[PDB]
Design a protein around this ligand. Structure first.
Ligand SMILES: Cc1cc2nc3c(=O)[nH]c(=O)nc-3n(C[C@H](O)[C@H](O)[C@H](O)COP(=O)(O)O)c2cc1C
Ligand SMILES: Cc1cc2nc3c(=O)[nH]c(=O)nc-3n(C[C@H](O)[C@H](O)[C@H](O)COP(=O)(O)O)c2cc1C
Ligand SMILES: COc1ccc(CCc2c(C(=O)O)[nH]c(=O)[nH]c2=O)cc1
Ligand SMILES: COc1ccc(CCc2c(C(=O)O)[nH]c(=O)[nH]c2=O)cc1
Lengths: 313, 313
């Protein structure tokens, strides 16, 4: 029995990795993720310049999940590029680098300088589309024309296979449209579904107060709240993008949750809130739990059941 | 002491009611809701003609909530109109009738007939802006131009105060746009936030199968999964629509959950999944629980804390 995967011309011991933003902002964090049993890691979504991010408190967790309005705190592109170029031990596991420029021009500038390092070292790019553009407009992946522009410009500037991190959608017409935009771009080789469920609001009954400071308490939701939304999006893109990989993210706390992602279509499975809460030891637990489900079902490899969710009648 | 309130020129014993679609399809259901301790009831969204809805199983519930693709099964507008006109006992509690025509014309035809019954009996209209998916276009509330057309036509045809049932939004720009549309219409006197979170997917690990038969298992989510989503929409529209009431719906299982909805801005609080699971007994429990939280806090009225959620700095 085994959890090995071979994709994007890399080899992965198991499908598990951190979700961007969790345990991946500093060198310490990346060394930690590298030392863990995960099959890969992704760096914190970065901007050209370093950012402090939003005022604290800006992340909070609870039994059913988490809320965050971090504001993209990060060390800046040059730091992540350097980690990729000079510090990461690729003999341990593959590295993804996530970018989240605040304009199409900022993303283009970063990808242009990433490319030679991707070529030489094998770092894999995750472009975060679930991200601000012009304030008062919707996030980029909710504005199909902007999304198309970003992918056109990044495809031309980068010129190498990459993937994209997508917000969740809630309407079949959006699944259809979004997948059709993605399928215009042959360099988009993987699609990660999903980023947080946007602009939720957690309120504490005792204090009668919101629990995070930025945006009057509004922020993105992760964890147990979002599993069925995540599964829907993984399966929707799996069905609509037959020439691309889908990576699943959202609501993974157990090997069973990971199994469901994989049934839906996931290749890699990313862990955000649960990793933030439990720490990197979660990866040994998830591996063991997934293997136990596989042994009970008689599955020897992930490809035996990936995308094989049954429908009724 | 007691939870009675006055809204929309009617008196309510308490802020609780069923969510449209739950316990409200047949005369038996409407009589049961009427006999319960709820403050009001709403009928099943209807169409001009009866509908059988989608194949079964089309609803399933789990510890964290529910998934449904009911397909608008209903007895047809003539039935709900006759209930409103001849059968409902207005001395017991107010009645809302939910309409969900498949085109603007069908909604105009129903509301022209409802208007004199609204005038004579005081039945209240809830216009459901969600509908079965049609390839190539989004649900009406997710197409702002369509939404504006529907409200323009219904406002003209009906001519009396009414409300609208909204799906959730996830992006602040969308909140700004949707609220600007709604605020064009002075007869829209209440907004109900939210309908189910669209197109989630629940998978059963043992069977490796989706749990509902329609739409390859995709369906709207309710219950615990959607509480922070629901609160965010309630508060976003409460802030943006100061001349309207906001009715909260989503994730209410306890008087604490109802308390949070009211803190966010809810005037009435609707109960879907939890009502489907627990039955109409739930209303006495929610009343008791809400009054107990009020007493512990020193609140004597709902007005003392409605919309008064606190932000940080
Ligand atoms: C504190 C925090 C920071 C995040 N930062 C990023 C980020 O920089 N880039 C990104 O693509 N997603 C980011 N996300 C989203 C996660 O990658 C993930 O999509 C989301 O949390 C859902 O997965 P989960 O249910 O396992 O938490 C962040 C999430 C959290 C909780
Ligand atoms: C079985 C079922 C049928 C529903 N039918 C309708 C409907 O006819 N009209 C409507 O506006 N909402 C309908 N809904 C949505 C609910 O009114 C409510 O918005 C949603 O379930 C979220 O609330 P909850 O978390 O309390 O379940 C239905 C929900 C369920 C579970
Ligand atoms: C509302 O302010 C922001 C600013 C940047 C982003 C992109 C980074 C990001 C963040 C974040 O840094 O706040 N959190 C998430 O849950 N997902 C993300 O993709 C998301 C939201
Ligand atoms: C995308 O599929 C549908 C089908 C019917 C409707 C309208 C009725 C309705 C239903 C339903 O009858 O399936 N379920 C809900 O959760 N909310 C509703 O508003 C809304 C959406």
């Amino acid at each position: 029995m085994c959890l090995k995967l071979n994709l994007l011309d890399h080899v992965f011991a198991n499908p598990f990795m951190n979700a961007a933003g969790v345990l991946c902002s500093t060198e310490e964090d990346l060394r930690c993720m590298t030392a863990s049993s995960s099959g890969a890691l992704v760096s914190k979504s970065c901007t050209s310049a370093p950012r402090d991010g939003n005022p604290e408190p800006r992340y909070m967790a609870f039994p059913l999940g988490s809320i965050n309005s971090m504001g993209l705190p990060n060390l800046g592109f040059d730091f992540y590029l350097k980690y990729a170029s000079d510090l990461h031990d690729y003999s341990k596991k593959p590295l993804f680098l996530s970018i989240s420029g605040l304009s199409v021009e900022e993303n283009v500038a970063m990808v242009r300088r990433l490319a030679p390092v991707a070529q030489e070292k094998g770092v894999l790019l995750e472009l975060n589309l679930s991200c601000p553009n012009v304030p008062g407009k919707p996030q980029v992946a909710y504005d199909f024309e902007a999304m198309r522009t970003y992918l056109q410009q990044v495809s031309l500037a980068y010129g190498l296979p990459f993937g994209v991190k997508m917000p969740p959608y809630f309407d079949i017409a959006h699944f259809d449209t979004a997948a059709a935009v993605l399928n215009e771009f042959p360099l988009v080789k993987f699609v990660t579904c999903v980023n947080s469920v946007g602009n939720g609001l957690v309120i504490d009954a005792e204090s009668e107060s919101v629990v995070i400071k930025p945006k009057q308490g509004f922020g993105g939701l992760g964890g147990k709240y979002i599993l069925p939304t995540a599964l829907a999006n993984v399966n929707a893109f799996y069905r609509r993008c037959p020439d691309k990989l889908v990576f699943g993210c959202g609501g993974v706390y157990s090997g069973e949750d990971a199994f469901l992602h994989i049934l839906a279509g996931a290749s890699m499975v990313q862990v955000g809130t649960a990793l933030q809460e439990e720490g990197p030891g979660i990866f040994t637990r998830l591996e063991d739990e997934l293997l136990e489900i596989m042994a009970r079902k008689g599955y020897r490899t992930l490809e035996e059941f990936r995308g094989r969710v049954k429908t009724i009648e």
